[PDB]
Amino acid sequence: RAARARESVDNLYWFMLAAANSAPDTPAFVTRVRTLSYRELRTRVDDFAAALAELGLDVDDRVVLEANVTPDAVAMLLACSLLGLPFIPVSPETPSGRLRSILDTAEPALFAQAEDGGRADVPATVGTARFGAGGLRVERAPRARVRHRREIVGTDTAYIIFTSGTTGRPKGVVMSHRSVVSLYRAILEQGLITPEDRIATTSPLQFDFALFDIGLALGTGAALVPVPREELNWPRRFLAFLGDTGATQVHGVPSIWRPVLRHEPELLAGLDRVRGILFTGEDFPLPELRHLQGLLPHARIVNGYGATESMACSFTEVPRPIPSDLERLSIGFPLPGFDVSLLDEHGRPVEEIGVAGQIHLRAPSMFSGYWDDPEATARVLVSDPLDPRSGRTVLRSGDLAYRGEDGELYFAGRVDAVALLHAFIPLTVNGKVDRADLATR
Amino acid sequence: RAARARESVDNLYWFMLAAANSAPDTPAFVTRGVRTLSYRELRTRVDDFAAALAELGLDVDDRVVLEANVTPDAVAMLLACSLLGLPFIPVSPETPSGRLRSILDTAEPALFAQAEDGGRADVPATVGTARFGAGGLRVERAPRARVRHRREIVGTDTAYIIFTPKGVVMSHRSVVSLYRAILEQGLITPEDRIATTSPLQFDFALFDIGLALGTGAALVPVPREELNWPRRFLAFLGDTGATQVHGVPSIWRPVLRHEPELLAGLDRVRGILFTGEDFPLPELRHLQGLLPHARIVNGYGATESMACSFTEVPRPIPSDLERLSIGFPLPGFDVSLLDEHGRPVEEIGVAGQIHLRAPSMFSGYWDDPEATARVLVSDPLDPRSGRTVLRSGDLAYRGEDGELYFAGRVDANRVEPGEVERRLLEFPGISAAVALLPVLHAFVVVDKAKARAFCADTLPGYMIPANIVAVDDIPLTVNGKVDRADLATR
Ligand SMILES: Nc1ncnc2c1ncn2[C@@H]1O[C@H](COS(=O)(=O)NC(=O)C[C@H](N)c2ccccc2)[C@@H](O)[C@H]1O
Ligand SMILES: Nc1ncnc2c1ncn2[C@@H]1O[C@H](COS(=O)(=O)NC(=O)C[C@H](N)c2ccccc2)[C@@H](O)[C@H]1O
Ligand SMILES: [Ca+2]
Ligand SMILES: [Ca+2]
């Protein structure tokens, strides 16, 4: 009786598990060294979907998935996907006060955590479950409800990413199945990755960088290599992990390299299997970037630029070697089927090389809105200033950029705007500079 | 310097000419003796038109009015506008100059294009002008010089705007999404020949062109001249080898009155598709009886989503059937019936307003954000997500299997005129019935006082037509719908 996305409708289930039909016995995950096959992953998703369907949740009903990137956590989000149940990924590190704030806003039907999970006292108004290879064990069944939705569509919400927005307000980026799949399709077209690759992923699941890495790898028929968040503090254990698992690509915010470059630059030079590194989140300090390049000279580095509101925007290979005169890394060209206007303060095109204007993004991968915040949505998703009467929307990015002589882009910071407004690093759960931490001094 | 949609971007050019790569030598068009145009020949025409259009320096989002009916050249033009991200505004040559000039003033296009033999002249100096045909695209007045500011064409770029002054803006990604949904349903194969009857300014034409070319089937444009005369129309369908015939219900009315024996003789016709309005059931049952080896499909939807549902009519049609079903939305489409408070109607037989979730949704009404905010709204089942649904302005109820039934516009002591006109059908000899509203006149295709008494039986006094007029045919709009307005005057 539960609704299920059809094979022909944009949906993470069908997008990520297509490799179960071409190459069922190929590795989807590498853990520690154990592989999990595409077929094994599909069975786990189908088992979780069968248990989830029993609960009587309507399409658009929200499941909080509290977990790090694990084979089980991905099986759960793909089982939420097939049933049109939007997943809200939460890091176990998240303090209980912030979870309870997301539970109050998002009003989910169910909170799901790993079998060995430590979260207690989730409110009585929300259902609770635990997942493992054992299956999905319900602790408290979700409320009785009448199912109103007959059919799952590609514009249905896949996931909501919750952060504290720039005011106090909880920021919930609502992303449709069709928006995410569109990003995955665009980046597959680039051909960064092959089925023979093993993607070491470092981001927490509540960061769409993790959602990028999962989709990129499974979409391609490659293997995902979740790096346990613990091993990242311990540079020798981190390099040992990448070596032992045969990781060919390492994805993470710039932060993940700082401990390794200070304490174990000799051992990093020893990872001969690594063909590629990908980063996003913030500027890669150029001294650390030139150091990292020097230590793995046969490894392509990709600068990934974009926001949660579109998942991503551009992927530019860092010049090898980095020019000795280079001021700034290029964020290159938007992906095929993506487009940027640089507009001045009045929304007029900037058409001078070297002059910064606000990025306005046209993309197939656009968010649907900010959870319960239509004012904020109307200030970010706006009438295209180059076509204001059509009703077409663009993303008013709040990011500045300028163009070089071949039309490539350069990030020039926030229009809101380590130095602060003083000169100084404490990291956010996502691996960013905790600028709010440093500003309290 | 001119931007061109890439092969990986949702775009009518790449969607409709995909068959040029798989089956270049297969027929894209059948015209009229009887000539085919191949997918390869069509594509070369599109590329030639795109090269001429690119010369003009138009930016992406700049509008081209395409005044033409469905022809090989008119389709080459809209596919050349598509590749260059130049939204096309289709206008029928039979549109009065009053209404064209109204579209040109609101749309403020960069270019007006018409056929070489085209009958338009009176075009403002602020708009460029060109003529397309054999040989190519002749510019008469070059459009204004401008700076090209858009670097790259994207799937959310406007493919076309349909004007009625109401402008439905439709993205490339929205249309292609409809084409993909209906391809999934497998209505048509590459062996088929689709006779299309709609004017190009009606998205039914845009439906038929994309359905056929998307599939790798052949399009058979029926010129309006061939359509008006029943035996000419059937001789055209026969001579071209049409296997599917698409049009509003009215394309069958002359043929069912004057030439039912000849219509029964179209053995190559495997399928008929209609939309626009209710097919009066007596004419529908007659048509089905005459071609029993032809599947009949009811297409339901509005321009705001191109379409919504495609339901095969029961074979044979029950003689006691009250209303034909608009069935289930396509895969990836979904309907709620909501009450006046946006509350789910969950009682069989109770009418509520259709709210549609679809991958094919319009971007907005040209220059009308107030109207856009009244039609494209917060999902009332999910108001906090920001997901938008189409407030359709169409009433409907469900049967026991969840199938839908159109119950009229919410526009339409209140008088439900679908209920007046439907109970006039039951009276014998009435094949079709318009009712309109001060006094309720009803006009019927086939004395009075028995039709009236037959009404007085099963209807309340205020829903009893004061005057019932027999007619030969119903006056049609350019798009082929009942001309309510025309009847109102007489
Ligand atoms: N390559 C950059 N250089 C420098 N500043 C940057 C850069 N990529 C973002 N940023 C900054 O970070 C913001 C985005 O923050 S976010 O919304 O949390 N999203 C992300 O951090 C990453 C994004 N979801 C993503 C995921 C996967 C692949 C690519 C991109 C941008 O608006 C920039 O201000
Ligand atoms: N099959 C119907 N029975 C009964 N009332 C109907 C029906 N199809 C529309 N309608 C009515 O006509 C309205 C839509 O009119 S429209 O916007 O001009 N669009 C069309 O008529 C054609 C539509 N775009 C289309 C094109 C191609 C394939 C399918 C559908 C609906 O809102 C209904 O009021
Ligand atoms: Ca423009
Ligand atoms: Ca709901």
CATH of residue B19:
3.40.50.980
User: Are A81 and A89 within 8 A, CB to CB?
Assistant: no
Report which protein residue has its CA nearest ligand 1's atom 5: A282
Residues written for chain A: 441
Closest CA to A275 of A298, A259, A255, A293: A298
User: Residue B186 domain-assigned?
Assistant: no
Tell me how the structure was determined.
Answer: X-ray
Domain with residue A392: its CATH number is 2.30.38.10
Residues written for chain B: 490
Distance CA B127, CA B98 (A): 16
Does any ligand 2 atom lie closer than 6 A to the CB of residue B372? no
- Gyration radius of chain A over CA positions: 21
Contact flag A390-B184 (C-beta cutoff 8 Å): no
Distance CA A225, CA A242 (A): 9
The amino acid at residue B285 is R
Does any ligand 1 atom lie closer than 6 A to the CB of residue A334? no
Who among A151, A153, A386 is closest to B149 (CB)? A386
Same domain, A188 and A88: no
Closest CA to B453 of B433, B441, B440, B468: B468
Q: Which ligand sits closest to the CA of B110?
A: 3
Phi and psi angles of residue B402, each rounded to the nearest 5 degrees, phi first: 80, 0
Torsional class of B186: left (φ above 0), alpha (ψ -120 to 50), beta (otherwise):
left
Compute how many other C-beta atoms are within 10 angstroms of the C-beta atom of residue A258: 16
Residue B409, chain A, CB below 8 Å: the answer is: no
Task: Give Cα separations from B446 to A309, B228, B257, B430 (angstroms).
Answer: 60, 19, 10, 5
- Residue whose token pair is 């679908």: B418
* Ligand 3 mean position, distance from CA B146 (Å): 10
State the DSSP code for A273. Answer: T
Task: Give Cα separations from B70 to A86, A225, B91, B93, B426 (angstroms).
Answer: 44, 55, 11, 11, 37
Under DSSP, is residue B250 helix (H, G, I), strand (E, B) or coil?
helix
- Residue whose token pair is 């009893």: B464
Same domain, A170 and A196: no
User: Residue B285 domain-assigned?
Assistant: no
User: Residue B78 domain-assigned?
Assistant: yes
Task: Return the bridge partners of A339, or none.
Answer: A362
Extended strands (E) in A312-392: 314-317, 339-343, 357-362, 369-370, 381-383
- Gyration radius of chain B over CA positions: 23
Peptide bond into B316 cis (omega under 30): yes
Domain with residue B450: its CATH number is 3.30.300.30
Same domain, A356 and A285: no
Same domain, A253 and A325: yes
Give the alpha-carbon dihedral of A45, A46, A51, A55, to 10 degrees. 90
User: Residue B327 domain-assigned?
Assistant: no
Contact flag A363-B335 (C-beta cutoff 8 Å): no
Domain with residue A261: its CATH number is 3.40.50.12780
- In a 13 Å sphere around the CA of B74, the CA atoms on its Cβ side amount to 25
The helix/strand count (H/E) of chain A reads as 13, 21
User: Residue A121 domain-assigned?
Assistant: yes
User: Residue B235 domain-assigned?
Assistant: no
Chain B residue numbers touching A387 (CB-CB < 8 A): 61, 158
Closest CA to B207 of B12, B425, B58: B12
* Resolution of this entry, Å: 2.5
Under DSSP, is residue A149 helix (H, G, I), strand (E, B) or coil?
coil
Task: Return the bridge partners of A382, or none.
Answer: A394
User: What helix, strand, coil percent values describe chain A, rounded to 5?
Assistant: 30, 25, 45
Give the distance from residue A379's alpha carbon to the nearest chain B alpha carbon, in angstroms: 13
Closest CA to B192 of B224, B214, B225: B214
Furthest C-alpha separation in chain B: 72
Same domain, A196 and A292: yes
Which of these three, A306, A336, A366, is where a domain ends? Answer: A336
State the DSSP code for A381. Answer: E
Distance CA B316, CA A160 (A): 49
Phi and psi angles of residue B469, each rounded to the nearest 5 degrees, phi first: -110, 120
Residue B134, chain A, CB below 8 Å: the answer is: no
Same domain, A158 and A183: no
Which of these three, B135, B153, B171, is where a domain ends? Answer: B171
Chain B residue numbers touching A147 (CB-CB < 8 A): none
Same domain, A313 and A348: no
Closest CA to B455 of B415, B485, B483, B488: B415
- In a 13 Å sphere around the CA of B28, the CA atoms on its Cβ side amount to 30
Peptide bond into A374 cis (omega under 30): no
Task: Give Cα separations from A70 to A66, A278, B210 (angstroms).
Answer: 11, 20, 44
Same domain, A210 and A352: no
Number of domains in chain B: 2
Compute how many other C-beta atoms are within 10 angstroms of the C-beta atom of residue B115: 18
Under DSSP, is residue B417 helix (H, G, I), strand (E, B) or coil?
helix
Report which protein residue has its CA nearest ligand 2's atom 6: B277
Distance CA A241, CA A222 (A): 18
Task: Return the bridge partners of A171, or none.
Answer: A163
Structure tokens at A388: 């204001």
Chain B residue numbers touching A153 (CB-CB < 8 A): 332-334, 357-359
Residue B379, chain A, CB below 8 Å: the answer is: yes
Same domain, A242 and A311: yes
Which helix (H) or strand (E) covers residue A129, if one does?
A: strand A127-132
Structure tokens at B288: 């089905």
- Domain span at A168: 12-18+30-140+151-174
Which of these three, B171, B202, B227, is where a domain ends? Answer: B171
Distance CA B148, CA B59 (A): 5
User: Are B72 and B62 within 8 A, CB to CB?
Assistant: no
* Ligand 1 mean position, distance from CA A210 (Å): 13
Residue B186, chain A, CB below 8 Å: the answer is: no
What strands lie across the sheet with A87-90, from one edge to the other?
A135-140, A127-132, A110-114, A63-66, A87-90, A157-164, A170-176, A369-370
User: Residue B105 domain-assigned?
Assistant: yes
Helices marked H in B247-307 — which ranges?
Answer: 253-258, 260-263, 281-290
Angle between helix axes A38-53 and A71-82 (nearest 10 degrees) is: 50
Closest CA to A153 of A172, A174, A176: A176
Same domain, A383 and A309: no
Contact flag B61-A386 (C-beta cutoff 8 Å): yes
Distance CA B159, CA B203 (A): 12
Distance CA A17, CA A78 (A): 9
Does any ligand 1 atom lie closer than 6 A to the CB of residue A361? no
Same domain, A157 and A188: no
Residue A334, chain B, CB below 8 Å: the answer is: yes
Same domain, A348 and A331: no
User: Residue A23 domain-assigned?
Assistant: no
Distance, first Cα to last Cα, chain B: 57
Q: Which residues of B are annotated as a binding site?
A: 61, 275-276, 278, 298-299, 303, 381, 394
Instruction: Report the b/e string of A68-81 with b at 16+ CB within 10 A.
Output: bbbbbbbbbbbbbb
- How buried is A62 (Cβ within 10 angstroms: 0-12 exposed, 13-18 middle, 19+ buried)? buried
User: Are A66 and A112 within 8 A, CB to CB?
Assistant: yes
